């Protein structure tokens, strides 16, 4: 199957779709299911790939013009004009929340009772900036009743960063140092999953799931900027169906 779903104890009316690079019509560096319109792919091809995804979802998808911000919008309001935002929330079941990535961390949210969902784009900038905290707040449900899913991202082994990224997290949040491993010359291996778990736990989120893939290592499944540069974007979607 070209489509995956989140492995978490989410209620039956909370649906997810974790797309892979397969099942689309794009070619070359964008091979196949590229959902991003900002990466240099053929516009018509991207439109077709998004159609393929919509067919799977059965609802309009709130694609955002992601700018690595910490801005959260209501997915239901993001359809009549692409907003500059990096996360969306919904409690209507009339639209699917979605974030596009190719290494950056996608985080999906829902509550145990299935009354609200959300998707957040957590690159290192948005993650260190508080995009997850803002998303949690926008959902208006008790954090303890929330569960988060860590989608496919670049793993620690492949995510090498500098002191600036390190400080962005560890200066204001010292415990975050546990998610960085020094490899010499002022370079570190950053663990986005671990950083997200720390942030989510500190915020009060009841449970965190996922975080088992590496977009760089799994080349036959995911797009990766670190691995290929100009390439496609897969997406992590979530919606209420019930």
CATH of the domain at 3: 3.60.140.10
- Resolution in angstroms comes to 1.5
Q: How far is CA 173 from CA 129, 177, 201, in A?
A: 11, 8, 13
Q: Report the C-alpha gap between 172 and 150 in whole angstroms.
A: 23
Report the SS3 class of residue 108.
strand
Contact between residue 116 and residue 110 where contact means Cβ atoms under 8 Å apart: yes
Residue owning tokens 């990535």: 101
- Rounded CA-CA distance 99/105 in Å is 9
CA–CA gap between residue 32 and residue 28 (Å, rounded)? 8
Chain center to CA of 131: 11
Number of domains in the chain: 1
Domain range for residue 95?
A: 1-242
Q: What's the helix, strand, coil split of the chain in %, to 5?
A: 30, 30, 45
Q: In what order do the strands lie in the sheet with 72-74?
A: 72-74, 87-90, 117-122, 105-111, 146-150, 207-210
Q: How far apart are CA 217 and CA 224, in angstroms?
A: 9
What's the burial of 195, exposed, middle or buried (CB within 10 Å: 0-12/13-18/19+)? buried
Which technique was the structure solved with, according to the deposited record? X-ray
């Amino acid at each position: 199957k070209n489509f995956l779903t989140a492995d978490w104890p989410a209620p039956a009316n909370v649906k997810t779709l974790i797309t892979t690079r397969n099942g689309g019509v794009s070619q070359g560096a964008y091979q196949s299911l590229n959902l991003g319109t900002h990466v240099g792919d053929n516009p018509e091809a991207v439109r077709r790939n998004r159609e393929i995804v919509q067919q799977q979802v059965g609802l309009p998808v709130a694609y955002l013009n992601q700018i690595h911000s910490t801005v959260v919008v209501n997915a239901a309001e993001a359809l009549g004009g692409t907003p500059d935002a990096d996360a969306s929330v919904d409690d209507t079941g009339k639209v699917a929340c979605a974030v596009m990535t190719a290494d950056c961390l996608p985080v999906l949210f829902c509550d145990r009772a299935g009354t609200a969902v959300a998707a957040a784009h957590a690159g290192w900038r948005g993650l260190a900036g508080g995009v997850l905290q803002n998303t949690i707040a926008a959902m208006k449900v008790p954090p303890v009743e929330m569960m988060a899913y860590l989608g496919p991202a670049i793993s620690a082994d492949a995510f090498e960063v500098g002191q600036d990224v390190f400080d962005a997290f560890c200066t204001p949040m010292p415990e975050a140092a546990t998610a960085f491993e020094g490899i010499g010359s002022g370079k570190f291996l950053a663990d986005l999953y671990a950083l997200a778990r720390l942030i989510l736990k500190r915020e009060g989120v009841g449970g965190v799931y996922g975080g088992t893939h590496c977009t760089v290592l799994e080349r036959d499944t995911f797009f990766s900027y670190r691995r290929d540069g100009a390439t496609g974007r897969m997406a992590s979607l979530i919606w209420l169906d019930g």
